Amino acid sequence: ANKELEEKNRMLQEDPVLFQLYKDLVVSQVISAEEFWANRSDIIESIFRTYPAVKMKYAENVPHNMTEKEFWTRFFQENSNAAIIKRFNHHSAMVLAAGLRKIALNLKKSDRYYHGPTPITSQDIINSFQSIRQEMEAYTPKLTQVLSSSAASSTITALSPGGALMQGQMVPNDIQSELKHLYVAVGELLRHFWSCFPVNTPFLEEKVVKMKSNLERFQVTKLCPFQEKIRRQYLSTNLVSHIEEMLQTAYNKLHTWQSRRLMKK
Amino acid sequence: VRLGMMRHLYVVVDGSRTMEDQDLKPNRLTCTLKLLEYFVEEYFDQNPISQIGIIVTKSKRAEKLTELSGNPRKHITSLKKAVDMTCHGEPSLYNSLSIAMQTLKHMPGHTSREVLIIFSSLTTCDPSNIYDLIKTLKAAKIRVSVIGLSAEVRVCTVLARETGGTYHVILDESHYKELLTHHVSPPPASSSSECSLIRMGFPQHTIASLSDQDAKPSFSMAEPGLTLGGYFCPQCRAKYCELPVECKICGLTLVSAPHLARSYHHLFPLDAFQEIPLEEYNGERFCYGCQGELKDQHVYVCAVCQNVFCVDCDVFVHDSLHCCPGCIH
Amino acid sequence: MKLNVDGLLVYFPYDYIYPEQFSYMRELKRTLDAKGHGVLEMPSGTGKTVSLLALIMAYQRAYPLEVTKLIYCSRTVPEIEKVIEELRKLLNFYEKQEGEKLPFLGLALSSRKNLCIHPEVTPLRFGKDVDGKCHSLTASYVRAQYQHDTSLPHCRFYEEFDAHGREVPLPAGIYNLDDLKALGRRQGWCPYFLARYSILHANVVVYSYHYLLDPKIADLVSKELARKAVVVFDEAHNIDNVCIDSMSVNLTRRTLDRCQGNLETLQKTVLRIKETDEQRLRDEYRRLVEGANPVLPDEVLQEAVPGSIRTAEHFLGFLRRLLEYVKWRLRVQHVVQESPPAFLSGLAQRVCIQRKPLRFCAERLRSLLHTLEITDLADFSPLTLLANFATLVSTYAKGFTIIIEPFDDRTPTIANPILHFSCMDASLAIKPVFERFQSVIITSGTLSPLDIYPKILDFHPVTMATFTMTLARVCLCPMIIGRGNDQVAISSKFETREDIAVIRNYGNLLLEMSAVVPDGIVAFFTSYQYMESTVASWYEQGILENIQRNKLLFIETQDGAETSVALEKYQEACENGRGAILLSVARGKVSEGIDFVHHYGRAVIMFGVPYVYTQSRILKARLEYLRDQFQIRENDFLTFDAMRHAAQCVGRAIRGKTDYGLMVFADKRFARGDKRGKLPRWIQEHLTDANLNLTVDEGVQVAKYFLRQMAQPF
Ligand code: SF4
Ligand SMILES: [Zn+2]
Ligand SMILES: [Zn+2]
Numbered sequence A: 001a002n003k004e005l006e007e008k009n010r011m012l013q014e015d016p017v018l019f020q021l022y023k024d025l026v027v028s029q030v031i032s033a034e035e036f037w038a039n040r041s042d043i044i045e046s047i048f049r050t051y052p053a054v055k056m057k058y059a060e061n062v063p064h065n066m067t068e069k070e071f072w073t074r075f076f077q078e079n080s081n082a083a084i085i086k087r088f089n090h091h092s093a094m095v096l097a098a099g100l101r102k103i104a105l106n107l108k109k110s111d112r113y114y115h116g117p118t119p120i121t122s123q124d125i126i127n128s129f130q131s132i133r134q135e136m137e138a139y140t141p142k143l144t145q146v147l148s149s150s151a152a153s154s155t156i157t158a159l160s161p162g163g164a165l166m167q168g169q170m171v172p173n174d175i176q177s178e179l180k181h182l183y184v185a186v187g188e189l190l191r192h193f194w195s196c197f198p199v200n201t202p203f204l205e206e207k208v209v210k211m212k213s214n215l216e217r218f219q220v221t222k223l224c225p226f227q228e229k230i231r232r233q234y235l236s237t238n239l240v241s242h243i244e245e246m247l248q249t250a251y252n253k254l255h256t257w258q259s260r261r262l263m264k265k
Numbered sequence B: 001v002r003l004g005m006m007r008h009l010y011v012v013v014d015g016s017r018t019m020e021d022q023d024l025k026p027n028r029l030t031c032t033l034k035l036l037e038y039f040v041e042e043y044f045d046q047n048p049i050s051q052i053g054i055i056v057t058k059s060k061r062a063e064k065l066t067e068l069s070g071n072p073r074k075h076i077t078s079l080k081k082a083v084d085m086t087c088h089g090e091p092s093l094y095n096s097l098s099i100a101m102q103t104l105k106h107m108p109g110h111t112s113r114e115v116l117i118i119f120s121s122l123t124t125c126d127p128s129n130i131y132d133l134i135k136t137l138k139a140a141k142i143r144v145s146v147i148g149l150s151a152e153v154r155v156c157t158v159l160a161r162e163t164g165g166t167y168h169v170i171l172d173e174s175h176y177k178e179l180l181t182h183h184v185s186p187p188p189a190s191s192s193s194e195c196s197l198i199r200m201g202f203p204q205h206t207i208a209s210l211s212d213q214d215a216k217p218s219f220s221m222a223e224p225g226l227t228l229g230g231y232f233c234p235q236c237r238a239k240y241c242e243l244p245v246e247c248k249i250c251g252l253t254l255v256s257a258p259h260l261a262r263s264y265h266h267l268f269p270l271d272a273f274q275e276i277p278l279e280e281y282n283g284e285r286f287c288y289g290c291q292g293e294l295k296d297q298h299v300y301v302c303a304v305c306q307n308v309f310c311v312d313c314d315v316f317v318h319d320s321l322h323c324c325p326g327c328i329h
Numbered sequence C: 001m002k003l004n005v006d007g008l009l010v011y012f013p014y015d016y017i018y019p020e021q022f023s024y025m026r027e028l029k030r031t032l033d034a035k036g037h038g039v040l041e042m043p044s045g046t047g048k049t050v051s052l053l054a055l056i057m058a059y060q061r062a063y064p065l066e067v068t069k070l071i072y073c074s075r076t077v078p079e080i081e082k083v084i085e086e087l088r089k090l091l092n093f094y095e096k097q098e099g100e101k102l103p104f105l106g107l108a109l110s111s112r113k114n115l116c117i118h119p120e121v122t123p124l125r126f127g128k129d130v131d132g133k134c135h136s137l138t139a140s141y142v143r144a145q146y147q148h149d150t151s152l153p154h155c156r157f158y159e160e161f162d163a164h165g166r167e168v169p170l171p172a173g174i175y176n177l178d179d180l181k182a183l184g185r186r187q188g189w190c191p192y193f194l195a196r197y198s199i200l201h202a203n204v205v206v207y208s209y210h211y212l213l214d215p216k217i218a219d220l221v222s223k224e225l226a227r228k229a230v231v232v233f234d235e236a237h238n239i240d241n242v243c244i245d246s247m248s249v250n251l252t253r254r255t256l257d258r259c260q261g262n263l264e265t266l267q268k269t270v271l272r273i274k275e276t277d278e279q280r281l282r283d284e285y286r287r288l289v290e291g292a293n294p295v296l297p298d299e300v301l302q303e304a305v306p307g308s309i310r311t312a313e314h315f316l317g318f319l320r321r322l323l324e325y326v327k328w329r330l331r332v333q334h335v336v337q338e339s340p341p342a343f344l345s346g347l348a349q350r351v352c353i354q355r356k357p358l359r360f361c362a363e364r365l366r367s368l369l370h371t372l373e374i375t376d377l378a379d380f381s382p383l384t385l386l387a388n389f390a391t392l393v394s395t396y397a398k399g400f401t402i403i404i405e406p407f408d409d410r411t412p413t414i415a416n417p418i419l420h421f422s423c424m425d426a427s428l429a430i431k432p433v434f435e436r437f438q439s440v441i442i443t444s445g446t447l448s449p450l451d452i453y454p455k456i457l458d459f460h461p462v463t464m465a466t467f468t469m470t471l472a473r474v475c476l477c478p479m480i481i482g483r484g485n486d487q488v489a490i491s492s493k494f495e496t497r498e499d500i501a502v503i504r505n506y507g508n509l510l511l512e513m514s515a516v517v518p519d520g521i522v523a524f525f526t527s528y529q530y531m532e533s534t535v536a537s538w539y540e541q542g543i544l545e546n547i548q549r550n551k552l553l554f555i556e557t558q559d560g561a562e563t564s565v566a567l568e569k570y571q572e573a574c575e576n577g578r579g580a581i582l583l584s585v586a587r588g589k590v591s592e593g594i595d596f597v598h599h600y601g602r603a604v605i606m607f608g609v610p611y612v613y614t615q616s617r618i619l620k621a622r623l624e625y626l627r628d629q630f631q632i633r634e635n636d637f638l639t640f641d642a643m644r645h646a647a648q649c650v651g652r653a654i655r656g657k658t659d660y661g662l663m664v665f666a667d668k669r670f671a672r673g674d675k676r677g678k679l680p681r682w683i684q685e686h687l688t689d690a691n692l693n694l695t696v697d698e699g700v701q702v703a704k705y706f707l708r709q710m711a712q713p714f
């Protein structure tokens, strides 16, 4: 059946983001669309489920020279006393049937955590210890020793923006939307490209997807510079170099791992 | 006991009408939402590598309020929005569990799957039988630990014990914080549960090289403006505003060094300190930890350092600091 | 876990015993030491049998000569099956301690219908039909014909059992009904008769009351062999009703019409016999001259001579005459008639039937019936019922009464009158038990005060001990809700039953309670007619729909098949989260038969005091006699029956294992001191005055609080 066609129509306009990027892969005629998707009331309903007799009646009494309002009228319509008990037990039984479809841890080296991932004679201790011991026998020099006009002033100058220890542009905005669209464009297609890359997949069926994806990387990126060229040749300002890293670094991973494959063979 | 360092827990909340009833001081639904915010905020604060996903089940339908994520701010925002939720309908445990199972079915083996169901209305109308689902959960090694509200319902009683989780009921609002607070800690991994190594990458924060020379402009990765500097990836090479976020491309978890060091206190729990009220030859009137006079007949000591800690120090050390001050020496 | 009781050392399998158990064993030992019949109450349904059994095992070993055998009876076979499991567990524990087999045998008897291995009777389910087939297979003619080994189905199991079962008795072992059936199959012996033979030497024998009360069957299996045996009844609070029903015999127009047709078949059978077999069968006349069982107990039973009735032609006319008198006396249209001694005089004068020849009619019928080589007794069963009634009336009427109802209740005019012979005192039928057996212990739960039973049953108890369960956690949380949100009297009085507010209040209570009560809850009404009116009133209102939304609701009907299906669905609802509200009648067979356990009937609801239609003449005759003799007020017994019955159905929620369960009484009457006094000790003492008159909404709130405390673990 044409299940895919119906799904596309539902998402044709309901959600822009999903369809917006899918077309872009075909706007420039990059690759076939087959690989795109291949890789990636209540009251009447209750009576419909609850009472089998109504279900049978509805099929046999399907609207024919009648009205739904008239059908609604038919719903509500000592021996009579027993009917309520039988109906409720039957009704309760039907509802019930309706909802029933047929290690102590241990370690060898805990010191490693104490000196964790963060990376990096004897007489000197004695000599230093004694010298400091006799240092503070004179104390409370606060009057002048703590600060001086020259020393204090130098600190203020350093704290100024020009001074040391105090080091200290949204011009493009319309272009921002295109980059975000491009960013989603790269992310949407990189995801599939990186979907199988981390896993080695030593199998032809899984590896074939890698080759198709690996070749597809060039195809999607073949058209990328063309869009880049137009944007770049505007004011030569606010260069977009990050977007290149993902593609170039994707190439390097592709080329390196592809080269590694030959060595393994 | 070895614990599950990385866990994917779902906080299923019932949108039942019974939540409308106010047995507690505020509206029951608001209170759970108010307190659930504490758990969500605290949950990541004591387990960064983990991730959470909330589900709300109302009118016999289970709708994923938020997918699995590592940002407590996003989840908390949904909680604020859910405060004004209609809260009219009947929950369906089968719908809720089924929704969680689908998402959690594809999770990696190393992670410790979990679910926390805040049960309020004792009734549970479901499209199909749940015992078949219960069997699937055990084969799916999903730990479901319901937290009932005002009911020791049998259906959940088997669920928690049969599936390996824990069942509880809210004695009062104050007791409610204790129950959820217990689930914050990584539950121990049982015999059935297994473990495996997980790949991760540490994103070195980078800024402009030298006065905007060879700059790296970009906006974000999930109205973000251009950013001079941001976290990158060993493989994505994508600018991530904040950490820890799973690679939107690689699928590999990115996490800074401190976050991993945050959870080490779980591995090495501090041994409790014996409480002796009398002085017992303790000649230090001032507490060693806080250098404050002991106005109570209470003292705490270690088995190695053998120091003195008042009630305030011991309460603090075992609550937040998760280490003995003096015994570090 | 050996217990060094004051009397002796008693072995006990389980880890710990509550303080009440200590009192239980010593109290029981006191009566056993005194060798005198007594009555006692213990709340726990489970663990009571083992504690009761445990002392007997120790007592038997300490004083084997004092007590011959233990006769522990249970109300229903489904409940006796679980009892023997407790004994089996105890025996293994006791045997393990000793380390070797001991001369101890335990088995449970039952009807051939419940247990058998013969394929022909297997498809049949009706009890009467089973006896007819088995009787025919084991009939002397078949046995005599079996010797000839002619071409005719002979039930092999009994044939080889006589040659084998008689010679070799089973040394020891515990065999439940299911296990006993398997043993017979492998050994090719009757599970029924083999157990019957074992009664000669069986330390513990357990069977229902109807095997120990009705003289027709109880006497033969309960022969004097048990000169000094510890006979015990379990949950025997309604012992009188079962004891009285054994004596009571009902004769109806439909039954009488069946008898007339059956008698005609009997007449035809004799005619065939006369032309075919006369001399050989006539020999039984000499046996009769020389000199299904009679219902007369030991002393009452008489076998002097057959009397005037000595031949089939003569005897059949005797029944013909008696049948006609009952036929005419029954067809009379008038008010309900009572004539205990006058009916015998009226029958004797009207159709010239002396009582003495009429006394032996039932026995003569069986003797004559045997001579007829009938195919089965099932067809003629109604005739025997009349014969049993025929001899019973002619025997004695001092503590009896013939009640004739030309018009039946619930019917403006019915052409099927029923002649009642309801008894009035249970002491008559239970008298042989007390005399034959040295001591009887009437152990029961939910027992209304003990002092009445010696008045109802003519006996002198050694002790009157009431036990209240003592637990670290207060499992049961009883309450009485006599006032609703409207603060209006909620008593389900006969004149006040028509009140809409009272009907509304019960729906409000159930609706509100259903919100808080977890899965599993049961509601008990006073009568089916009242239940339907309450259901209809709720159905017309939105209260029932709200209850349906809160939880599933099930109602109970007279037919067992509907009840069985509904009850099975109920158990399904509790297992899932749906929960079910099973509305039932307190006096309905469903309530007594069913047992409610953890997450089953969590909040048992007693809607109104359970009372019978006082217009029932049969109850009046029983009620009137108790006022005439034994000095019991008419209202006192009537309240006692309701209080004992109300406690009967509501006491199941606390079966055992300290499974939390609350009981709510939806009637201000229970709050009255008289009602509370008749309430069982364990339920009564826990109940306090503070919560005695809880409001409908106030009761709901405390119930929610109660669940919270019980919800948390120990
Ligand atoms: S003789 Fe024994 S086996 Fe045969 S029908 Fe009777 S009880 Fe069953
Ligand atoms: Zn990455
Ligand atoms: Zn301190």
Ligand SMILES: [Zn+2]
Pocket (backbone or CB within 6 Å): B302, B303, B304, B305, B306, B307, B324, B325, B326, B327, B328
């Ligand atoms: Zn220390």
